[PDB]
């Protein structure tokens, strides 16, 4: 019967893959959405353990001994995309809160801008996510392992950083650095007055920053869903082989 227990766990994985796919196809990923994605991918990992624990050649005949390949796609692929999505989504959500506070930092003066309030908020964003890498979730890996995943995640959202014990793929904070440097270039005394024309380029610039970061996140979500779809197709073949 243990062969059928395997098929019941493999079928529980596809059931989770189905819910995971829907969650990732929502335009906006909320803090609630992330909590659900963590549970599903976590439930995935558990059943991938029981599968290997519990563990026609026509149907078998590329990204993927059966246990040493399913545990390979999840450990060194699905879990990586998952945590990358979590970290970047949390960063973006925290960035959106700063932009939401922007309206209350502008007033007529011709526009007066609270450059200090904006700068210090973005500084906190940078400080907060300096030790929240995309990959790995804990500890470190080899510089070569870190680079392998930078190419897979993209140099737009990630950068290999040296940390105690080895290397990680950190969040690329260049966009935040871009904003902070731009704010420094404005000068002032805590506040600054911008002619209407210059403020219009900054407001529209802030909105463009947001859309760029949103697009970065959606691209990463796309890669996680694609990997999950490759993983589901591998599970598919097994559920029909054991049957």
């Amino acid at each position, epitope marked *: 019967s243990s062969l059928t227990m395997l098929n019941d766990t493999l079928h529980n994985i596809r059931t989770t893959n189905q819910a995971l796919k829907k969650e990732l196809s929502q335009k906006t990923l909320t803090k609630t959405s992330l909590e659900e994605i963590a549970l599903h991918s976590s439930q995935i990992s558990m059943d991938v353990n029981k599968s290997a624990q519990l563990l026609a050649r026509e149907l078998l005949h590329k990204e993927a001994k059966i246990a040493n390949s399913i545990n390979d796609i999840n450990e060194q692929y699905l879990k990586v995309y998952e945590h990358a999505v979590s970290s970047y989504t949390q960063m973006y959500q*925290d960035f959106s*809160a*700063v932009l*939401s*506070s922007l309206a*209350g930092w502008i007033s007529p003066g011709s526009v007066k801008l*609270q450059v*200090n*309030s*904006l700068k*210090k*908020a973005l*500084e*906190e*964003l940078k*400080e*907060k996510y300096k030790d929240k890498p995309l990959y790995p979730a804990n500890n470190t890996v080899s510089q070569e392992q870190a680079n392998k995943w930078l190419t897979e995640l993209g140099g737009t959202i990630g950068k290999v950083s040296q940390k105690n014990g080895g290397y990680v793929v950190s969040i690329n904070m260049t966009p935040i650095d871009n904003m902070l440097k731009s704010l420094d270039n404005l000068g002032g005394n*805590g506040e600054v007055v911008l002619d209407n024309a210059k403020y219009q380029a900054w407001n529209a610039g802030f909105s463009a920053e947001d859309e760029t970061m949103k697009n970065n996140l959606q691209t990463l979500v796309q890669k996680y869903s694609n990997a999950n779809s490759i993983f589901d197709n591998l599970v598919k073949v097994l559920s029909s082989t054991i049957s």
Partner: nanobody
Framework: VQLVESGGGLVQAGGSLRLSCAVS????????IGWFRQAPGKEREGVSC????????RYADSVKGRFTISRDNAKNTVYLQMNSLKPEDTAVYFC??????????????????WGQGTQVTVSS
């Protein structure tokens, strides 16, 4: 949302006090929490703030190096260690929370919830 301060009282100039803020009614791990003070006649004044995960703390120039803010997301408590107290520090001290995760410049009108305050009196 309820914010309850304790730890105030009377103290001699040069002495110290530790304020404690009991936070009830909000996911404390998601909001910046800070301390304000208001002496009579003078305007409310930002003192310190600590963002939702504690990776940044902020202090007014008047208290930098003397005060220390800390938070315990577990115990739903925020502390303000007040050392090297001066008569200038005499005021009602308020615990306050923001709707956002970050501190930025401490500004009273950007804080969502307020405690009743507790008196700190420094006599030289």
């Amino acid at each position: 949302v309820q914010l309850v301060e304790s730890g105030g009282g009377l103290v001699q100039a040069g002495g110290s006090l530790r304020l404690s803020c009991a936070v009830s009614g909000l996911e404390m791990q998601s909001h910046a929490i800070g301390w304000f003070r208001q002496a009579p006649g003078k305007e409310r004044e930002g003192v310190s703030c600590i963002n939702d995960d504690g990776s940044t703390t902020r202090y007014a120039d008047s208290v930098k190096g003397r005060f220390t803010i800390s938070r315990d997301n577990a115990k739903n408590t925020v502390y303000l260690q007040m050392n090297s107290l001066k008569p200038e520090d005499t005021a009602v001290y308020f615990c306050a929370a923001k709707s956002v995760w970050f501190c930025s410049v401490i500004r009273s009108h950007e804080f969502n919830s307020w405690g009743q305050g507790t008196q700190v009196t420094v006599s030289s």
